[PDB]
Design a binder for this molecule. Structure first.
Ligand SMILES: [Mg+2]
Ligand SMILES: [Mg+2]
Ligand SMILES: [Mg+2]
Ligand SMILES: [Mg+2]
Lengths: 204, 159, 169, 292
RNA sequence: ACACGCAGUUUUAUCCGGUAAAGCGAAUGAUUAGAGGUCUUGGGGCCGAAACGAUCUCAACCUAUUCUCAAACUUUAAAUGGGUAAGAAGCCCGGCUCGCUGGCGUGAGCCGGGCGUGGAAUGGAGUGCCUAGUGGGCCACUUUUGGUAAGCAGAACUGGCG
RNA sequence: AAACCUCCCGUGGAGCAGAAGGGCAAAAGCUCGCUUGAUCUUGAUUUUCAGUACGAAUACAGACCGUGAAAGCGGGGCCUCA
RNA sequence: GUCUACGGCCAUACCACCCUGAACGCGCCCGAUCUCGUCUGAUCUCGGAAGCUAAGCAGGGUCGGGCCUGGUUAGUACUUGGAUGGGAGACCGCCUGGGAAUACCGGGUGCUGUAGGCUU
């Protein structure tokens, strides 16, 4: 059907997103960028497990969807249907072109063939958060999802608390002092620059 | 090939900076430009009449003619083989005084002062500028405290 | 003990929207001249609407603005027609209110076979002294923050001055 | 509710206009044409006559513009008229004419051209222009700056202009907007203009109101009843005021001194006081909250 | 025994830009997900004759957050780079001319007089006539367009083969 | 939900004939009043450039004017092509 | 200390709310015969001084937003010049020099020219 991923692996052209100039782009293969028990709080699923790439290459949307399916299936099998949260942090915006030969190379400018995501070295690809007891299951799910991507990517567990930008060790102290207010999937940080009415709303 | 448009490629060159649109300040309108004044040209998109060409933007020239609301400036322009001293007519709003010559004028006045002065004294003063000399060897006093060690930091993956 | 915070009527606005063409609008203007005592002006359409039977720059409605004691008298007549009855929704958040009358014959104008029944919409603009700042030429400025007319204050002013019997809903 | 128009991004991208434009005082579109001088002169000032009719005063000044700020070379005020004779009516057409005459005569006295360019002594209302005399210093030239005033027929800025040109200043002007011009006939009467210059309109209204209603006469001209000024005395009072102005237009600024130097306003609070105040408010709220 | 002038250089001053980067909790456009909203209205529905009365849901929106982007987006914003100045053709005085401009004034041009190494290092420079051949190029580091790619086609700087 | 009237918020998110970019808020947009500087004539300069033409444009100057109280503005279209 | 008229730089000057204004001044305000223009003296224009800080205006306050200026981010991202450096490549490290921008955390919230007033 489509060309092998070897053709569109390297970042050779400038980013070519879908816009007014580039129309007729087929829809991306991946449509759901996060699944599982996404309707959960910060305090119940702190793991912050990440998959980080080491190559400046392009990851196809089909590969992203396949890896998401595999990781979700293994995670459901191991932990449970609502015992984790998987988030994909790559969206296919770059559009690749196809010059199909039934004229030669004259007037060679391809039509939109598909969507691809440009990934830098050290950029997070997929993230999974769950309870502390499921560390082995998280790393196994990420290792299984590695085989659905080209290049070389590492599996890392960060010091952050879940999908937040605050360290896990200092998270509880900040929550206790009400520096951090939970808000759905994430947490809300309140500085001291706000009007005193907002501070009076809390601490009471 | 590209078009021969006069204002081609001037999307950002002839554009007012951020939060600086609107009425042109009147200080620029009431500045005088004598003959032989060094002036650097910067185009302004608010005024369309008297607009200098894009090749003279950022160039510096000398004023040789003056009109009611414009001046004539001779500006050197290189065309693929040589530098041509050509004269153009530019309106006042695209014209400002160059501050490169004022430092030289100030140094000339200071040198004239140092020439009139210290002449009856008999001691010749250094008038010529000199580059940065060696750093004039000195003493460093570490009173009490010893220098602090700076060991390299072990690597850890943060991403 | 407010020195110059007494609510007054800035203007009274009257308009009749016939909106077909010509003679009917002229008759509405005749009614406006009979009632307000001043020659009104015609308002043209903003754009063509096929359903309403109107076209661009076509004179739809005629309106007149009355200020001073004459506006007060016309408002007295129009409010006496309505039996001093208003609602909460008839009061706007900007401190102004208005009402409509189905037939102008109740105002005190004799009917005619040619110039028949024409209703009209009244609108009262309340204010305080010093409201001319926002509309004067040179040193235009906003009228403070505690000087603007509130909806509840307009309700109380209508309740006291005209003995209002406003009802909820 | 609504979508908040004035968000953070609204103020981030908001570009305020000039301070005078925000205050609604200066029309920079007209100021650019009125103030800027041709480049081929390099020093010649562009004098303009700024006239501002205030609520209870008339201000007439002559100034030229500089980069650091325009310099007022001469000034005249309507509140100075009682010194010369005009006790009441400081914001009428005759007051504007007197102020313009005072400004013109004071400038000519300062520049030493008091004897030359006497102007029109016998006021008639006709169009008058001052021609420079050969072998003598040239007549002073300036331009009228109306400002934001709507220049129609009968505006008092043109009364000040007429006073200035009768003082001996070469101000380019026409007779279109002087009181007396007929819009429907395109002709200038030149007699109604003399009536307005001499304050005859005010006297006519005074007589008409006195004949009509005594109470309205008392209310409209309450301070005219004081100082004993009557419609019969108006024209000679204004003529004597003109003569006194032409006799000696110099100014005699009072010697201001003996200032107590006290702060009537409120001094600004310091940073430490603000920080301590917010901390004390936090502590007080905590103490009050730990009660119920 | 005795130097003017010029530079694919640098230094000291003074102007120009909008690329790399970064941002989209800032404008435009794309876009993920949770909390508070009958803000708004509408579709299926459930408890209801119905009810903005309870419960969610899908629509485009809002209130503070959150994931990812832009050669034809941008508040910011480089490195590299491009103009000028570093004095005798410059300054400081005195006096004349002006059908220009001006209240006096300007502004320009004419004559007389007094003051010389104007940052570093290297070069001798300036100027005028005729004038053959050439007008198919190619390769490489770096930046870069189309193409899956090419010992492919096409650009920029520099260096080579020719 | 869209007819007309009133008040408030409204950095221009509208409009300026067109394609796009820049620019513009008591304007360069809308409505009015007057006009035909879309007039006649020497030169100088800018864009492509060989620094040659054509077209387009920029400061001037000499007369006739228009407009406004005036300062001023205007010898076509706010500028980049027609 | 402060105001008025004309301004210069155009938010340290703006926006939202609250408090204070002694004197001059600035305005609200009172009317439409004359000048003037409107459907309406609402605006403009003209004729005035019975009341007022109600409003504008001036000053001050907000653990205010914004704005201006710093630290952090960070010698990080990026980048001139170099290698018969590594790697299959993608890319990366080193040598020689220059050197950012968010989030986050601090400070400040108009100076000033001419002329004329008040506090005498
Ligand atoms: Mg004007
Ligand atoms: Mg980039
Ligand atoms: Mg050969
Ligand atoms: Mg001409």
């Amino acid at each position: 059907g489509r060309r092998p991923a070897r053709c569109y692996r390297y970042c050779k052209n400038k980013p070519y997103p879908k816009s007014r100039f580039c129309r007729g782009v087929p829809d991306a293969k991946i449509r759901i960028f996060d699944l599982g028990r996404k309707k959960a709080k910060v305090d119940e699923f702190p793991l912050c497990g990440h998959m980080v790439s080491d190559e400046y290459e392009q990851l196809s949307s089909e590969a992203l969807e396949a890896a998401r399916i595999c990781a979700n299936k293994y995670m459901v099998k191991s932990c449970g249907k609502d015992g984790f949260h998987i988030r994909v942090r790559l969206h296919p915006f770059h559009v690749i072109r196809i010059n199909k030969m039934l004229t030669g190379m004259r007037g060679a400018f391809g039509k939109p063939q598909g969507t691809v995501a440009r990934v830098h070295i050290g950029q997070v690809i997929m993230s999974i958060r769950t309870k502390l007891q499921n560390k082995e299951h998280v790393v196994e799910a990420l290792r299984r999802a590695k085989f659905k991507f080209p290049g070389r990517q590492k599996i890392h567990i960060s010091k952050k608390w879940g999908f937040t930008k605050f360290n896990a060790d200092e998270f509880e102290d900040m929550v206790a002092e009400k520096r951090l207010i939970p808000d759905g999937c994430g947490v809300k940080y309140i500085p001291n620059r706000g009007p005193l009415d907002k501070w009076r709303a809390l601490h009471s | 090939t590209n078009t021969k448009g006069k204002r081609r490629g001037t999307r950002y060159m002839f554009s007012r900076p951020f939060r600086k649109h609107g009425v042109v300040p009147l200080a620029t309108y009431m500045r005088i430009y004598k003959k032989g004044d060094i002036v650097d040209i910067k185009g302004m998109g608010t005024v369309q009449k008297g607009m200098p060409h894009k090749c003279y933007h950022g160039k510096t020239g000398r004023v040789y003619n003056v009109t009611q609301h414009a001046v004539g400036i001779v500006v050197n322009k290189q065309v693929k083989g040589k530098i041509l001293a050509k004269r153009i007519n530019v309106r006042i709003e695209h014209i400002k005084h160059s501050k490169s010559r004022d430092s030289f004028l100030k140094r000339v006045k200071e040198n004239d002062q140092k020439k009139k002065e210290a002449k009856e004294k008999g001691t010749w003063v250094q008038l010529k500028r000199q580059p940065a000399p060696p750093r004039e060897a000195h003493f460093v006093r570490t009173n009490g405290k010893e220098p602090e060690l700076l060991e390299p930091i072990p690597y850890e993956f943060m991403a | 003990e407010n020195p110059m915070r007494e609510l007054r009527i800035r203007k009274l606005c009257l308009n009749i929207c016939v909106g077909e063409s010509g003679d009917r609008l002229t008759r509405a203007a005749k009614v406006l001249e009979q009632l307000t005592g001043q020659t009104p002006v015609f308002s043209k359409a903003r754009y063509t609407v096929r359903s309403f039977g109107i076209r661009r720059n076509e004179k739809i409605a005629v309106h007149c603005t009355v200020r001073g004691a004459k506006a007060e008298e016309i408002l007295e007549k129009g409010l006496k027609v309505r039996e001093y009855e208003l609602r909460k929704n008839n009061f706007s958040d900007t401190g102004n209110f208005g009402f409509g009358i189905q037939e102008h014959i109740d105002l005190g104008i004799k009917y005619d076979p040619s110039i028949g029944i024409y209703g009209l919409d009244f609108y009262v603009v309340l204010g305080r002294p010093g409201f001319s700042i926002a509309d004067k030429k040179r040193r235009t400025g906003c009228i403070g923050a505690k000087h603007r007319i509130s909806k509840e204050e307009a309700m109380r002013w209508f309740q006291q001055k005209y003995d209002g019997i406003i009802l909820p809903g | 509710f609504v979508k908040v128009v004035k968000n953070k991004a609204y103020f981030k991208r908001y570009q305020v206009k000039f301070r005078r434009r925000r205050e609604g005082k200066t029309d920079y579109y007209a100021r650019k044409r009125l103030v800027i001088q041709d480049k081929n002169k390099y020093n010649t000032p562009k004098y303009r006559m700024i006239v501002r009719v205030t609520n209870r005063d008339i201000i007439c000044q002559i100034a030229y513009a500089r980069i650091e700020g325009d310099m007022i070379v001469c000034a005249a005020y309507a509140h100075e008229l009682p010194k010369y004779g005009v006790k009441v009516g400081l914001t009428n057409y005759a007051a504007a004419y007197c102020t313009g005459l005072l400004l013109a005569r004071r400038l000519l006295n300062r520049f030493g051209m008091d004897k030359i360019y006497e102007g029109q002594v016998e006021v008639t209302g006709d169009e008058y222009n001052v021609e420079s005399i050969d072998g003598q210093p040239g007549a002073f030239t300036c331009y009228l700056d109306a400002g934001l005033a709507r220049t129609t027929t009968g505006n008092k800025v043109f009364g000040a202009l007429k006073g200035a040109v009768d003082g001996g200043l070469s101000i380019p002007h026409s007779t279109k907007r002087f009181p007396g011009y007929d819009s429907e006939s395109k002709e200038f009467n030149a007699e109604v203009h003399r009536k307005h210059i001499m304050g005859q309109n005010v006297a006519d209204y005074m007589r008409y109101l006195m004949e009509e209603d005594e109470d309205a006469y008392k209310k409209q001209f309450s301070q005219y009843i004081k100082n004993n000024v009557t419609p019969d005395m108006m024209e000679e009072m204004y003529k004597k005021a003109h003569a006194a102005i032409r006799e000696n237009p110099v100014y005699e600024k009072k010697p201001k001194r003996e200032v107590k130097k006290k702060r009537w306003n409120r001094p600004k609070m310091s940073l430490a006081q603000k920080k301590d105040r917010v901390a004390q408010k936090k502590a007080s709220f905590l103490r009050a909250q730990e009660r119920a």
